Amino acid sequence: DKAKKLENLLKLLQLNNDHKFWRTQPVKDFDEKVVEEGPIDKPKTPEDISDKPLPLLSSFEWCSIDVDNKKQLEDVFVLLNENYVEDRDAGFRFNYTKEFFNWALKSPGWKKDWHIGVRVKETQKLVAFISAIPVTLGVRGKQVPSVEINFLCVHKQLRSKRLTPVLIKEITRRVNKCDIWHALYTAGIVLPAPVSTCRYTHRPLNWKKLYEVDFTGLPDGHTEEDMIAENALPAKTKTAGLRKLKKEDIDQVFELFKRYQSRFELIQIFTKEEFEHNFIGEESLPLDKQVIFSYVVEQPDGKITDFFSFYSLPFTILNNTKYKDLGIGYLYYYATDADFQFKDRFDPKATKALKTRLCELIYDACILAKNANMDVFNALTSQDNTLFLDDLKFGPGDGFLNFYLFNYRAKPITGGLNPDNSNDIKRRSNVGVVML
Numbered sequence: 001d002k003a004k005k006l007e008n009l010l011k012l013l014q015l016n017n018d019h020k021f022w023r024t025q026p027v028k029d030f031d032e033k034v035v036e037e038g039p040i041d042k043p044k045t046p047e048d049i050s051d052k053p054l055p056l057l058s059s060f061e062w063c064s065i066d067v068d069n070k071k072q073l074e075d076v077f078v079l080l081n082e083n084y085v086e087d088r089d090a091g092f093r094f095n096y097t098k099e100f101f102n103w104a105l106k107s108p109g110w111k112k113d114w115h116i117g118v119r120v121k122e123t124q125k126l127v128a129f130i131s132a133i134p135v136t137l138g139v140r141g142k143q144v145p146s147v148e149i150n151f152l153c154v155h156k157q158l159r160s161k162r163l164t165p166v167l168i169k170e171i172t173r174r175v176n177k178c179d180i181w182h183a184l185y186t187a188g189i190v191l192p193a194p195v196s197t198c199r200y201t202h203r204p205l206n207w208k209k210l211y212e213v214d215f216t217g218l219p220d221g222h223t224e225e226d227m228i229a230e231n232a233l234p235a236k237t238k239t240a241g242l243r244k245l246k247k248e249d250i251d252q253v254f255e256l257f258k259r260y261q262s263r264f265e266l267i268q269i270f271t272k273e274e275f276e277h278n279f280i281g282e283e284s285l286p287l288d289k290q291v292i293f294s295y296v297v298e299q300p301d302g303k304i305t306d307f308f309s310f311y312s313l314p315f316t317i318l319n320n321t322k323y324k325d326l327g328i329g330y331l332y333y334y335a336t337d338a339d340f341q342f343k344d345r346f347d348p349k350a351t352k353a354l355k356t357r358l359c360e361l362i363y364d365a366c367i368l369a370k371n372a373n374m375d376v377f378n379a380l381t382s383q384d385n386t387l388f389l390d391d392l393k394f395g396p397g398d399g400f401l402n403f404y405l406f407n408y409r410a411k412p413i414t415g416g417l418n419p420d421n422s423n424d425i426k427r428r429s430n431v432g433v434v435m436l
C-alpha cells in the first residue's frame with residue numbers, strides 16, 4: 001500500500017515509449033530503508049532444500065541443456081531469437097548465435113543442470129529457458145558468494161501463465177543446494193529490490209543505415225547529410241601502443257583491472273580463470289561471428305597502461321529490402337591508470353585525467369567497433385561512462401537497466417543518473433559490474 005506509492009513514482013520516472021510472487025521472496029521491499037547490509041533469509045544449508053523437480057503443469061518436463069551439445073544449444077538460441085522480443089511486427093529480431101552462448105553460458109563453474117529449460121512432453125520443444133552462472137560479488141565492501149541469472153525466457157504463446165515464478169523457484173532450488181544463497185539479476189522492468197538504475201545510450205556508428213532501418217531518427221531542422229557528417233569516424237585508431245589481448249598480457253591486465261575496479265560499490269570479483277575466459281573468445285572466429293573484442297595499450301617498455309572490451313550482439317532485421325541485419329557493439333569492462341597518481345577519485349584534476357583518457361580509449365573502441373562491421377555502439381551510464389558519454393556523441397537512449405540483488409539488502413548505489421534522468425557528470429556511478 002505505502003510500498004506502491006514509491007513504486008509508481010519509480011515506474012513514472014522510467015516512463016518510456018499486486019506482485020504476488022516477489023511478495024513471498026527474500027527481496028528488499030520498496031519502502032524498506034536498509035540500516036545494515038547482508039542476507040534477508042535465516043542462513044539455511046543444502047539439507048533444508050529438497051532435490052525434487054518443482055511441479056510444472058501437464059505436458060511439460062524439466063531439462064538441462066548442455067551447451068557443448070550442438071543439438072540442445074540450437075533449441076536455446078532458436079527459442080531466444082524468436083521470442084526474446086515483445087512485438088511480432090517490431091522489424092527486428094534478436095540474433096543469438098552458437099558463438100555467443102558458447103561464451104556467455106560456458107563460464108568457469110558452469111553446471112549444465114544450471115542451464116535450466118522447459119520442454120513439452122510429446123514434442124520436446126523447448127518452451128522456456130532460464131540459466132545462471134556462479135560468481136562472487138563485491139556488494140559494497142563485503143564479499144558475496146553468488147550466481148548471476150540471465151537470459152530468462154518463456155515462449156510467447158505461454159505468456160501470462162505465471163510460469164516465470166516456477167522457473168525462478170527451480171533455479172533457486174538448484175542453486176541453494178550448492179551452498180550459494182544470493183544472486184544478482186538485471187531487468188528492464190521495475191520490481192521490489194532496485195539497488196541501482198542505469199540508462200542505455202547509443203553512439204551511432206553507421207547513422208545512415210540506422211536511420212534507413214528506423215533505429216534512429218532525424219532531428220528537426222537537420223539534413224540527412226548533416227547527421228552523416230556528425231558521426232563520421234576515422235578508419236584507424238589514434239592512441240599510441242594500442243593492440244589486441246594476448247594471453248601474455250593477462251597477469252598484467254587482471255591486476256590493473258581489479259585495481260581500477262575496486263572503486264565501485266558493486267563489482268563482480270574476478271579470478272584469472274574466469275577473466276581469461278570472459279575476455280578471450282574461441283580460437284579463430286571470423287569477424288562476422290566473433291563475440292568479445294578486447295584491446296590493450298602496451299607502453300614501449302612493456303607496461304600495460306589501459307585496456308577496454310566490448311561484445312557483439314546482432315539483430316536480424318525484418319521488413320526492409322535494403323538491410324537484413326543490424327550490428328550492435330555493447331561496451332563491456334575497462335581499466336585505466338590515468339587517475340592512479342591521485343589520492344581522490346573525485347578530485348577535479350583526477351576526474352579530468354580519468355576523463356580525457358577514457359575519451360581517447362572509448363573513441364577508439366568505437367572505431368574498432370565500426371571496423372568490426374557494427375552499426376551502433378552501446379553504453380550504460382554505469383561505471384565511469386558519464387565522463388565521456390556526452391563528449392563522444394553517445395546519444396541519450398530510452399531504456400533503463402534496473403539492478404537487483406536476490407537475498408541481500410543494500411543502500412542505493414549511484415547509477416550515473418540525476419533526479420531528472422540526466423547523466424551525473426559530478427558523481428558518475430558506483431555500479432561496476434556489466435550484465436548482458
Ligand SMILES: CCCCCCCCCCCCCC(=O)SCCNC(=O)CCNC(=O)[C@@H](O)C(C)(C)COP(=O)(O)OP(=O)(O)OC[C@H]1O[C@@H](n2cnc3c(N)ncnc32)[C@H](O)[C@@H]1OP(=O)(O)O
Nearest residue numbers: 019020021022151152153154159160161162163164172183
Ligand atoms: C538462489 C539463486 C536463485 C536466485 C533467483 C534470481 C531471481 C531470478 C529472477 C529472473 C531474472 C530475469 C533477469 C533477466 O534475464 S531479464 C530477461 C527477461 N527477458 C525478456 O524480457 C525478453 C523476453 N521476455 C519474456 O520472455 C517475458 O515474457 C517473461 C517470460 C520474462 C515474463 O513475461 P510473462 O508475462 O510470461 O510473465 P509470467 O506470467 O511468466 O510471470 C509473471 C511474474 O514474473 C515476473 N517477471 C516477469 N519478467 C521478469 C523478469 N524479466 N525478471 C524478473 N521477474 C519477472 C513478474 O513480475 C510477475 O511476478 P509478480 O510481479 O506477479 O510477482
Ligand SMILES: O=C1/C(=C/c2cccc([N+](=O)[O-])c2O)SC(=S)N1Cc1ccccc1
Nearest residue numbers: 086090091092187188189213214215216399
Ligand atoms: O532496443 C530496443 C528495445 C529494448 C528493450 C525493450 C524492452 C525490454 C528490454 N529489456 O532489456 O527488458 C529492452 O532492452 S525495445 C526497442 S523498440 N528497441 C529499439 C528500437 C527503438 C526505436 C525504433 C525501433 C527499434
